[PDB]
Amino acid sequence: AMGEAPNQALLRILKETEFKKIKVLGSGAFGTVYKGLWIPEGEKVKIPVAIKELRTSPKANKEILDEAYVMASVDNPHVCRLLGICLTSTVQLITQLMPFGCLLDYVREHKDNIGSQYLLNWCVQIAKGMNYLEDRRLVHRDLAARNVLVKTPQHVKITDFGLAKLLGAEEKEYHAEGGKVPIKWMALESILHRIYTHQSDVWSYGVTVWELMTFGSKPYDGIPASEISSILEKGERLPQPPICTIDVYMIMVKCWMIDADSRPKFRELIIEFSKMARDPQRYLVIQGDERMHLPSPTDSNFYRALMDEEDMDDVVDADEYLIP
Ligand SMILES: COc1c(Cl)cccc1Nc1c(-c2ccncc2OC[C@@H]2COCCO2)[nH]c2c1C(=O)NCC2
Ligand SMILES: [Cl-]
């Protein structure tokens, strides 16, 4: 290979007839996500899935297959895995159902029952996912709490590869065209010069941490997008959240430095958040932190809750259903 290494990822084409109990989960800019059961015939397994459609265009099929290509390649516990595609008039993406929804909605809904240990563990897991993306030379370009999903309260994964770009071995930067991007998660060099790197992803990581530590506050709330570059050029940044020690806030501020190379590396963020996760109340101050429980797999109706009784026996999490 005179350039980069062959991508020998398998693309699995899933039969429409293998999918049952399709219900809408959510719709927005990402399109529409459904939940269902994937039943690979003659296997005696029922795999909870999400199914994503785009907003039958040739332009739509192109963009959904670009996301399929990116995801087919990624194998990490903190990144959404493509199970396959379904070739309906509109092409569909199939992934493991993340039953607790996106982490932004989760921290808003459960903001009175979320302790320091969950918040720091999520920061570690997101940094692990992002570090893996960097090892694969992938720039996500859309990291935000809305693009983190909750398998269980203890286990989150990065999703939405709609803006993701692969760098060649030679290459340091993605140079974008005129396409629309979430400005309030973007590094200043991305806003000003359409430059995207692993280090512009670290800026987005900082904003994502700020979203978690504020239990889902909107960054620069009620500031027009068009005013954001100016605010950042003046040296202004998101304020210290009430629960954050200077230790935690300083990591966020380092993610928002002007010199991209001065920002932390995801592998450094894994180390720092993991040390903090060993003594979480030294790093986040949450009223009532001590007495807080969220659902874990060792709960009465944990599995009963989000499934039908007739499916209970043969249900298999996609994480335990391995490339046959
Ligand atoms: C790219 O990966 C996926 C593939 Cl290949 C196939 C289907 C879905 C996805 N991923 C996504 C989910 C999602 C994933 C798993 N289980 C539940 C999910 O959705 C819960 C709620 C619904 O309501 C919206 C918020 O999330 N959700 C979202 C995306 C996503 O790309 N953009 C933002 C919203
Ligand atoms: Cl919002």
Domains detected in the chain: 16-97 (3.30.200.20), 103-282 (1.10.510.10)
Amino acid type, 100: F
Print the SS3 string covering the chain. Answer: CCCCCCCCCCCCECCHHHEEEEEEEEEECCEEEEEEEECCCCCCCEEEEEEEECCCCHHHHHHHHHHHHHHHCCCCCCECCEEEEEECCCEEEEEECCCCCEHHHHHHHCCCCCCHHHHHHHHHHHHHHHHHHHHCCEECCCCCHHHEEEEECCEEEECCCCCCEECCCCCCCEECCCCCCCHHHCCHHHHHHCEECHHHHHHHHHHHHHHHHCCCCCCCCCCCHHHHHHHHHCCCCCCCCCCECHHHHHHHHHHCCCCHHHCCCHHHHHHHHHHHHCCHHHCECCCCHHHCCCCCCCCCCHHHHCCCHHHCCCECCHHHCCCC
Residue 83 Cβ contacting ligand 1 at under 6 Å: no
Nearest-angstrom CA–CA distance, 25 and 36: 10
Nearest-angstrom CA–CA distance, 101 and 174: 30
129 is annotated as contributing to ligand binding: no
The ligand placed nearest to the CA atom of residue 147 is 1
Amino acid type, 99: P
Nearest-angstrom CA–CA distance, 36 and 52: 11
Look at residues 70, 244, 243 and name the one whose alpha carbon lies nearest to residue 161.
70
Please calculate the CA angle 141-144-148 and round it to the nearest 5 degrees.
110
Residue 202 Cβ contacting ligand 1 at under 6 Å: no
Residue 68 Cβ contacting ligand 1 at under 6 Å: no
Report in angstroms the alpha-carbon separations of 211 from 42, 101, 102, 108, 153: 44, 16, 12, 10, 16
Nearest-angstrom CA–CA distance, 253 and 118: 21
**44 C-alpha vs ligand 2 centroid, how far in Å?**
40
Q: Which atom of ligand 1 is nearest to the CA of 105?
A: 25
The ligand placed nearest to the CA atom of residue 162 is 1
**300 C-alpha vs ligand 2 centroid, how far in Å?**
32
**What is the distance in angstroms between the CA of the first residue and the CA of the last residue of the chain?**
29
Burial class (CB within 10 angstroms; exposed 0-12, middle 13-18, buried 19+) of 181: middle
**209 C-alpha vs ligand 2 centroid, how far in Å?**
15
| Active-site hit among 112, 135, 142, 308 | 142
Tell me the two tokens of residue 175.
């140079």
Give resolution, Å, one decimal: 2.1
Cβ-contact 34, 108 below 8 angstroms = no
Phi-psi sector, 163: left (phi>0), alpha (psi -120 to 50), beta: alpha
Residues 6+ apart with CB under 8 A from 149: 80, 98, 100, 101, 102, 103, 156, 157, 158, 159
Q: Which atom of ligand 1 is nearest to the CA of 26?
A: 23
